[PDB]
Every structure is written in structure tokens, then in C-alpha cells.
Paper text:
The hub protein 14-3-3 is an endogenous regulator of various NRs, providing a novel entry point for small molecule modulation of NR activity. An alternative approach to modulate NR activity is via their protein–protein interaction (PPI) with the hub protein 14-3-3. These 14-3-3 proteins are known to interact, and thereby regulate, hundreds of different, mainly phosphorylated, protein partners. In the case of ERα, 14-3-3 binds the phosphorylated penultimate residue T594 in the C-terminal F-domain, thereby reducing E2-dependent transcriptional activity. Exemplified, 14-3-3 binding to the C-terminal F-domain of the estrogen receptor alpha (ERα), and small molecule stabilization of the ERα/14-3-3ζ protein complex by the natural product Fusicoccin A (FC-A), was demonstrated to downregulate ERα-mediated breast cancer proliferation.
The truncation of the F-domain was addressed by incorporation of a C-terminal strep-tag (ERα(PKA)-strep), resulting in successful expression, purification, and PKA-mediated phosphorylation of ERα. Notably, the introduction of a C-terminal strep-tag significantly changed the 14-3-3-binding site of ERα. Fluorescence anisotropy binding studies of WT ERα, ERα(PKA), and ERα(PKA)-strep phosphopeptides to 14-3-3ζ showed a 50-fold reduction in binding affinity upon introduction of the strep-tag to the C-terminal end of ERα peptide. Co-crystal structures of 14-3-3 bound to ERα-phosphopeptides revealed why the strep-tagged ERα peptide showed a reduced FC-A responsiveness. The C-terminal strep-tag occupied the FC-A binding site within the 14-3-3 binding groove, forcing a structural rearrangement of the ERα peptide upon FC-A binding. While the ERα(PKA)-strep construct could be used as a representative protein for ERα itself, the protein is less favorable to study 14-3-3 binding and small molecule PPI stabilization.
Residue numbers in the entry:
A (entry chain A), C (entry chain A): -4 to 231
B (entry chain B), D (entry chain B): 590 to 599
């Protein structure tokens, strides 16, 4: 890897500088270099990795949706034939997006998940695995679509099982996992009732545990709880 | 308003 | 070039799709491919080229300013030594920025400027040449700084001379050239009085010619005139 | 407010 000659601490330092500069591709490359040093990641480092790749794939996903919408409009009755260019360029963006997802999944498989023994790290990485299979599912149209969807589901489910056993219902990792798995149910698995049930149950159990928290933990948990409520308002 | 998902733990 | 096998019209079509998708690096690569076909560019195509590279270099410039500010703070008395990483990463962004400027300048020199005979195209490309030397000047600190500054000045000056002879004072290309050359004077050449004089004279001469314009031309010209006024308000 | 420059003709 191109980062093999740089010190782990320098890669982490540069990832933080890249974030400040809004250079998310650089941030992700630095964090990939740090993961490939082979040591486990601290909580802060896990969040740098997640933030970096989410910004990268978020730009790709937004671009893919724009291009997919144009492509669908071109395939309506009455639309003039404009050639292969829209499909080709949508495919180019799609292939780049899939490559980033495969890169993240590769880091998780080699070897972040297998070395993650604490609940907070293991749930974090399994949520990430579910997220990046979910992004693959958003663009999948072929023979492997069902297996991609089931890979996301299986990763989310293992993360859910650990989080319910080992974390309080207000834990922000647990809350964000539930938020994302609920969205998976709603828009990937065609299970809006499961999505709504999960979001409501997660919100209500967190509400009942807020009394145990400091002011700063309360702020963290209620922020994600508001996102669950926002989705429930959209869906009902 | 697009539905919400998160990448971070906190 | 990687775009050598794609049709000119397909490159233009994909540049427009990339713009819609906010994929400005792709947009710039498509437009570079189109320029390298060797044919002159239409007005619309010139604007696609300019918009694409401006978005690319604009991200790099903003990142460079963030990193340069951090680097300067690290070099104040009382700041803790953090190693070479800030300088290294600022240099990385700087080198990438310089490469993009050199790419644009290369397209202008091979061979857009020499084939541009109409005032609108020639002024457009000479303004671009001034702009991209100006971006090189923003980061220059060495033996060639004065020559980089003079290259920007010379390109802007030739564009100004043509624009005053061949274009009305409300022409949007002429107005944007004056806006940018005024900023060059203010913040590159250490000539704020020249910057203010140029902006004021340009604004006043455009104001006197607005009566000749259609509603749509009036809208185009007054928009840029407002930017001249905004700069004058900032500087006085 | 940062001073204004433009890349486009129109
Ligand atoms: Mg070492
Ligand atoms: Mg495909
Ligand atoms: Mg371990
Ligand atoms: Mg516990
Ligand atoms: Mg041809
Ligand atoms: Mg340098
Ligand atoms: Mg010609
Ligand atoms: Mg004329």
C-alpha cells in the first residue's frame, strides 16, 4: 500500500488534518493505511475511519442517484434516444462506489472484526459491515442481489444481538445501529412494518433509560433518538 | 426530508 | 490520454452529466478529453471547461488555506512541536493544486489560445491563463514567484486590451475579467489602489451602457456588476 | 465575506 512507509501516528494525524480540510478521499486513504498497520483501533480511530469512508461513499451514492434518475427518465415512452452515455457514466460511478464498499468490507474482514472482542468495537464494525453491504444492495440488480441483502441483514443482526446483551438502550452505537437497520428494513428489505417497530421500540427503551445519564451522555443519546423520531414521522 | 442514517458512534 | 477512445460529443454529454452529479473531477477529465480532440470549443463548451476546473481547484485552494493556517499557528511561539506532518500534508495538497494549474495552462498553451481568433474566445482563454497563474501565485514562495506573478499580469493585460477594443463595457466576459484582475491587483500584486480604480471604472462604464441591453443581457451584466460593488464595499 | 472572483463568462 502507498501508506506502508508512513508511521501509524502520522497517518492518524493526517486523517484529522484531512477532515479539517474537507479532503475526505485523503482522510479515507490515511485511515486505510492506519488499519493496515495491523493494530486494533481506538474508539476515536474507529470513528475517523467511519466518517472518512461515509463521506466518500456518500458523494458517490448521491451522484449515482442523480444519474440513475436521468437514466430512468431516458427509458420512458416519448424520451428521445441519446445513446449509451448515461448508462455508461452511471455504470462508471457505480463501479467506483462498489470498489469503495469492497475496500471497506475488505478492511473489516482482514482483520478488524476478528480481533474486535469488546462489545463497543465489535458492534461498531458489524454495523459498518451491514452499512456497506446495504450500499452495495442499493445498486444491485443481478443474480447476487438476494445474497448481498442477506449479508447486510446478517451483519446487522449479529450487531443487534450483541448490543442488546452488552449495552444499555441509550448507548449511541446501539442507537445508530438500530436507526440504520430500521432504514435497511424500510427501503432494502421491503419491510416497513419491521422498520417502524424497530425504530419505535428502540426510541421507547432509550427514553426509559435517559434518567441514568449525565448531561453529556443525555445530549448524545437524545440526538440519535431525534433521528429515530424523524424517520417515524416520515413513515407514519 | 430524506430519512436519516448515521456513520458515527457519537 | 484515457479519454482518447471516447467521441468528442460523448465527452461533452458526460461532462454535463458529471456537473449535474456534482462530480467535478470527472467533469474536468471529460472536458480535458474534449479539448485534446483538437477542435475549437464553442461558448458553452468553454464554460463547461472553466466551471469544471474551477470547482476542482477551488476545493484544493480551500484545503490549502486550511492547512496553511494550521501550519502558521504551529510556527508561533508557545506552540508545541508536532513533527513534519502538517508541512508534509500541506505540501501534498499544494503539489496536487499546482498539477491541476499546470494541466489547465497546458491545455491553453496546446493549443486553445493560438487558435482563438474571435475576441470572445481569446479573452476567455487569456482570462483563464491569468486565473491559473494567479492560483500558482497564491502558493508560490520561491525563486520563480515574481515570474509567476508577472505571467498572470501579462495574460490579464492582453485580455484587458482586447476586451476594451472589441467588447462593450457590459459584456459579461469583460466584466468578469475585470473583477478577477482587480482581485489580482488587490491581493497578489499588493496594489489595492489599482484594484479599487479598476473595479470602480469597470462598474461605472458598465452602468452607462446598460440602457442598450435586453432584459436578459441586463440581468447577466448587473449580476457581475454587483460582484464588483461587493468587492469595493469590502475594500473601502 | 470573501471577495468575489468568477470562472464563467455568463
Ligand atoms: Mg512504526
Ligand atoms: Mg454495474
Ligand atoms: Mg481484541
Ligand atoms: Mg456493557
Ligand atoms: Mg469522432
Ligand atoms: Mg511546494
Ligand atoms: Mg480560430
Ligand atoms: Mg465586438
Amino acid at each position: 500500500g502507498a501508506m506502508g512507509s508512513m508511521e501509524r501516528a502520522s497517518l492518524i494525524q493526517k486523517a484529522k488534518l484531512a477532515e479539517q480540510a474537507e479532503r475526505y478521499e485523503d482522510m479515507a486513504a490515511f485511515m486505510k493505511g492506519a488499519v493496515e498497520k495491523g493494530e486494533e483501533l481506538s474508539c476515536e480511530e474507529r470513528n475517523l475511519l467511519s466518517v472518512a469512508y461515509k463521506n466518500v461513499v456518500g458523494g458517490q451514492r448521491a451522484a449515482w442517484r442523480v444519474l440513475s434518475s436521468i437514466e430512468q427518465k431516458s427509458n420512458e415512452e416519448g424520451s428521445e434516444e441519446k445513446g449509451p452515455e448515461v448508462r455508461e457514466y452511471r455504470e462508471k460511478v457505480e463501479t467506483e462506489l462498489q470498489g469503495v464498499c469492497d475496500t471497506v468490507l475488505g478492511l473489516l474482514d482482514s482483520h478488524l472484526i476478528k480481533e474486535a472482542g469488546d462489545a463497543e468495537s465489535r458492534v461498531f464494525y458489524l454495523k459498518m459491515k451491514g452499512d456497506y453491504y446495504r450500499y452495495l444492495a442499493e445498486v444491485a440488480t443481478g443474480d447476487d442481489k438476494k445474497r448481498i441483502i442477506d449479508s447486510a441483514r446478517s451483519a446487522y443482526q449479529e450487531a443487534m444481538d450483541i448490543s442488546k446483551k452488552e449495552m444499555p438502550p441509550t448507548n449511541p452505537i446501539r442507537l445508530g445501529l438500530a436507526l440504520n437497520f430500521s432504514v435497511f428494513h424500510y427501503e432494502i428489505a421491503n419491510s416497513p412494518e419491521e422498520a417502524i417497530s424497530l425504530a419505535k421500540t428502540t426510541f421507547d427503551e432509550a427514553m426509559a433509560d435517559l434518567h441514568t445519564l449525565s448531561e453529556d451522555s443525555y445530549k448524545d443519546s437524545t440526538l440519535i433518538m431525534q433521528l429515530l423520531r424523524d424517520n417515524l414521522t416520515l413513515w407514519t | 426530508g430524506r430519512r436519516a442514517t448515521v456513520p458515527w458512534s457519537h
